[PDB]
From a paper:
N. maritimus, like most archaeal cells, is encased by a paracrystalline, proteinaceous surface layer or S-layer. The structure shows that the S-layer is pseudohexagonal and consists of the repeated interactions of the Nmar_1547 (hereafter, NmSLP) S-layer protein. At the sequence level, NmSLP is arranged into ten immunoglobulin-like (Ig-like) domains. Collectively, our structural data reveal that the S-layer of N. maritimus functions as a multichannel exchanger for ammonium ions, featuring negatively charged residues that line several pores in the S-layer.
Our goal was to solve the structure of the N. maritimus S-layer directly from whole cells. Using subtomogram averaging, we mapped the locations of the S-layer repeating units on the cell, which were arranged in a hexagonal array. As a result, we produced a high-resolution map of the N. maritimus S-layer hexamer from intact cells. The central region of the S-layer hexamer in the map had a resolution of 3.3 Å, with the resolution decaying to around 4.5 Å towards the periphery. The first eight domains were well resolved in our 3.3–4.5-Å-resolution subtomogram averaging map. By contrast, the last two domains appeared less ordered, with the local resolution decaying towards the C terminus of NmSLP, away from the centre of the S-layer hexamer. Each monomer of NmSLP in the S-layer adopts a rough ‘cashew’ shape, facilitating several interactions around the hexamer of NmSLP. Domain 4, nestled within domain 3 and linked by short connectors, is slightly raised relative to the base of the cashew-shaped Ig-array of NmSLP, projecting towards the extracellular milieu.
Residue numbers in the entry:
A (entry chain B): 868 to 1301
B (entry chain A): 446 to 1012
C (entry chain C): 1374 to 1498
The structure:
Amino acid sequence: NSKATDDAVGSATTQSLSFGELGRLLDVTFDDVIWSTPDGANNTATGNDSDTCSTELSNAGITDTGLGATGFTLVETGAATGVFVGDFQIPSFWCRVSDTTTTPYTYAGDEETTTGLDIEVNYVDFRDASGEIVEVGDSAGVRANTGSVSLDRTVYPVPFGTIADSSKAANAAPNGRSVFPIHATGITSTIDSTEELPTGDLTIHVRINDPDFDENPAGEDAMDQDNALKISVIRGSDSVVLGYAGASERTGKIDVGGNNGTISNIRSFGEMDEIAPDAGIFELDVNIKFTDGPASAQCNSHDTLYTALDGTTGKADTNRFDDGAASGQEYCILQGDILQVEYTDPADASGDANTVTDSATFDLRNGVLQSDKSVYIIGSDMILTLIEPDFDLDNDSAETYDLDLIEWDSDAATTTMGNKGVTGAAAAFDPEPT
Amino acid sequence: TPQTILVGFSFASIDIQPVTDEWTSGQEIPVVIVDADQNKNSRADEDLDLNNPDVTLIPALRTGDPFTIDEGGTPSLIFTNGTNGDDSIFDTGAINNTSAGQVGNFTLNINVTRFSSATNITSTESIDTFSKRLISAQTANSSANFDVDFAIIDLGSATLETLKETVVDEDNTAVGFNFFNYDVRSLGADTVSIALLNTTGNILPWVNNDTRNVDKNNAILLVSNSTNSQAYVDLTNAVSDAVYGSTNTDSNVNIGFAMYFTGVGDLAAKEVIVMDFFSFGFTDDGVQSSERFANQIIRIEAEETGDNTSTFEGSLEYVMVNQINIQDAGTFSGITPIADDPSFIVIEDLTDEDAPRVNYNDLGADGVTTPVSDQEEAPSHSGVVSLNADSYKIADTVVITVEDLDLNVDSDLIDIFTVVSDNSKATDDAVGSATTQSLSFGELGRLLDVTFDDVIWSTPDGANNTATGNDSDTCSTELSNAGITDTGLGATGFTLVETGAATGVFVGDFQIPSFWCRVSDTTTTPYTYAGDEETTTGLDIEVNYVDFRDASGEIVEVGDSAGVRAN
Amino acid sequence: KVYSWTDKVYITIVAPDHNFDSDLVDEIGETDSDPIKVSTRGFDLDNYKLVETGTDTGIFTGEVILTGFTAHDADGDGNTGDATGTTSGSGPTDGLLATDDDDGLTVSFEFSEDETIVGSALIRW
C-alpha cells in the first residue's frame, strides 16, 4: 500500500518520473480506473450506506477484490519464446478508486457491478522499436445479458384441497368446500379420507434464462442473488405474494400486496438449480395450495383450515399468512385469476436493474369422456379415454387419479367400479392400469 | 545450465461416458477425470481418498437433501481426554434395538492438566462444497505422552428440525429406512464409537447428569466399539423412535455428535471427519413425485490411470428400485457410498433437469475454484412380457420372456426373482417377496402372476382349502391322485433368471399341467380354493408382469394372453 | 403519442454526442450537470438514468410506467387502490410515475448548459 505501484505488475521499488512510475509494468482498468483491492488506512469510506467497500465485497463473496487477490502474474510461454501469457477471472463486483492522486489509494465507499463497463489493460513498454517509452494497451467491454423468466403453461388449473383442510363438520356433500370427492354413490352418508381425491396442490415450475449466472460453462451454477425472484397471485386490484426465491431457503409466512416491509418474514424457496451444466437455465419447483390466494367472500362456504408455513404447528390463519383474513372473507383462488412471476435481473444488457414478468391465468374446464367405438362385445377391451384439462396439475410428470370418479350405470348394478364399489365389482373390469 | 520449476494449475474436465446411448439400470459406466492438480507424483499412482487430508478435492454426487455434517452450517469440533464413567452411554449402552440399551445419558469427566495450555483441544473447521468433507486443522502433536480419548462436535445451528427433514419416523411411514455412513480412518483408532446427542442448550462446553437435569435424555447411541472406521450400517428402529421420542419443541433442542475411541494417541496436522445421514422410502400410495424421496451423497474414489497420467478413472453404478426391493433394507444397505465404483438408489425416472449429476470442484489454471460437473439421464423402460406361441398344448413348456432393463440391479451378479410361498401373505404363489403392503395399485410384493381364465393359478394350502366340491374328494387330494405335482407356480419352481450379467432380459418357464385347482375367491388370504379341479384345455392362459416404473416412471399393468390348445 | 393510465412508455433518445466510449455503454441523466427530467402535469421524477442500447450505437433507451392515482374506483367494485399511485425510481428501468386520468407526459433532455430538448405526450381514456 505504501508504494505508488500498488496492485500493479512490477516491483515494489518505484521512482516518480515524467513518464509515470518506474515500477509500473502492466495495469488493468475498468472505466479507465485502475482495479485495486481496498487496503491501508484510505479505505475507510462507506459511501451512501454504512457498509465499507471491503466489507461489502466480503459479504458479496467476491474474493477477487483486486489484481493481487486473483494471483494474476505474467509467465513466459517458453524458455526463449518472449511472449508472456497471464489471465484472471472478471469479478461481478469491484470497488472503484475515488482518486489516484494519493498513496495508498483512497477507495470509494460502495462497490458497483462491472457489467457494461469497459475493461482496458495498459502494458508499460520501457523500450519501443526506436528504443524509448511508448504507452500501448488494448480495450474490451464486460458484456451482460438481459434476464428472462418463463412459465411452463399459459393457463393453470385451480387447485383443490381435502376434507382435513376445512373445519366444517363431516357432510355427505361438499357444501361449497374445496373438496373433490367421489360421485354420491361412493360416499356413505359422510365424506371421509378414503373417499376423495388426494391434495391438489399444483406444482408450477419457474424457469429463467440468464447467461450472467452461468459463470461455469461446464459446471454447476445456482442463482444466489437474494430475493431476485418474486412469485405472486393477482385478482384484479388485490395482490398476494407466494414467496421469494434466490436467497437461502428459510421459513416464512405469506404477505398480501407486499405490505410487510421486513423481507426475512417471507417464505423462501431457496436457490434455483441449473438444468444442465452448459444450459444457463435455472428451474425451481414450487407448489401452490388452494389457500394461497387473495381473500374473498365467495370462499366463506368452507371454514378453511390453513396449513402452517412457519415453525408452529397451529392451523390458524396467521400461521400461513402475515395477517388474518378480513371478516367474512377467506384466502383462496378463483377462476380467471392471473398467476404472475416477477424476476429482477441484477444486470441486463445495460448492466443495471431490470424487471421482467410472465403471466398465467387460472381456469376451469368441463370434462368429457370418449371411447374408440360405440358398441362393445362383452369381455372385450374398452379404451376409456378422459379428456379434461384441469387434472393436469404438473406438466413435468403424468399423475394418476382414482377410477372411482367414473361410475357404472346399467340394469345389472350401479357402482363406482373402484375399491369403493360393491363387493366383487373392481375385479370384474380388471383395470390396466388400476 | 540452470533449469527452473514452474508452479501452475490446470483446467479439469469430468466426463461420464456410457457404454451405449442410454444409461440403463445395472450398467457400470466409466467416469473419467482429467486433473493435473491431483497428480502430485510422477513416479507413482495417486489414489483419491476421503481419509487422506492431502487429497483436498473429491468428486461427489447427491440426491434429495441428505443430512451431511454441515447442514447446520460450519461445525465446531474439539478433542478431550478423560473417562466416560459408569453413567455414560458409551460403556453401558449396546446395540440391541432397546430403548434403555441404545438411548440414555452422556456424562464425562475431563483431565487435561497435562495437555498444552491445560485446555480442550480446539480445532479449525472447514467444509468442502461438494464432498461435504470436514477438514480439522489443529496442532500436530505426536508425543508418546499424548493420549486423547473423546471428541465432541456440534453441527453449528442444526437442530431436530434440521434433522427431521432427512431422518423420518420409521414407525409411521409406510416404507422408510435410515442409514448412517461414517469415515474416521484418518484418526487411526483401534475401536470407534459414535453417539447422537440432543439438548436444548449449548453443546460446548458439555454438561453432566449429576450437574444439571434440564434434559430428561440427551444420548442416542449409534455405533459402539466398531473395529472398522469405514462402515455403512443400517440404523435400528430405536434411533428413529428416539428422534421423535421427545415431546419438547424440536426447534428448541439442538443436536450434537459424540465420539469415543482408543489408540489415537497421535494427531496429525489435518484430520478429516465425514459422517452423514441417509434416508429412502415413500409414504402412503407413493405414486406422486412429492412422496418419493432418496436422500444420499455419493463420493467417487477415482484412481490414477498411470504413474504420470493426469487422467483419473472411476465408475458409477446405479440401481433402479423396484416394487420387490423397495421394502427390503438390504438393497439400500448393500450399496457402497465411498469406493472407486460407488452405487446409489434411483426412485424415479430422473431426466432433464433432475438427471443424476456428479459434481467436482477444481482449481483452474487461472486460480479460481470453478466447479466442473457432468450429468447423464437415467430413464425408465416399459416392461414387455410375451409368450413364445399363441397356443399351447398340455405340458408344452411355456416360457415367459420379460424384457425390462430397470430390474437389473447389478452388472456383476445374475439378477433373479423367486416365487413367494407363504399362505399368510396376500402375494402367495406370486413372483416377488414375502413382505407385501396393500396400496391403491394392488400389492407391493406382487411382481408377476399367471392366470387361467383370468384366475390366478395357486396351489391349495392353508386352512382355506378344505372345500370338497360336488364330491367327497378335496382339491389337493384330487390333484395328488391325478399325479399332478405341478399343483401351483411354487411347485413348478418357476423363477425369473436374467439372460446375462447385464442383458436386462429375464427368462422363465414352466410346464402347463393337465389339471389345476380354481380359486373360489381372491378376496381373502390365504386363498379359498374350489373343491374340484378342472382340465386346463381350452382355457386362456394369461400372464401379468407388474411394472413398478413405466417409461414415464410410474406403475403400468402389462401382460400377454395365450390359449391352452387341445386336439 | 397518446397513452392511458396504468401504461408503460418506452423512451428512446438518439444522442451520438454522448457516445463517449465505444466499448462502454454510455449513460445520461445520472448527474445534475446532465439531467433527465420526466414530468406530468403535476408530478415529475428527477435524475432519471438512461442507458445506451448498444456499446457503440449512440441511442439511449429506457422505459417508465405510469402508476396513476389511487383515488379512483376504476373497477367499480366500490373500493380504492385500483392503481398503486407512487412516484419513485432513478434507474433506467424502474421508473414509477403517478398520472391523472387527464394529464400529459413531458420528457426533457439536455445536451449543453442552458439548452434543453423536450418531448411531449398526452393522457386520455
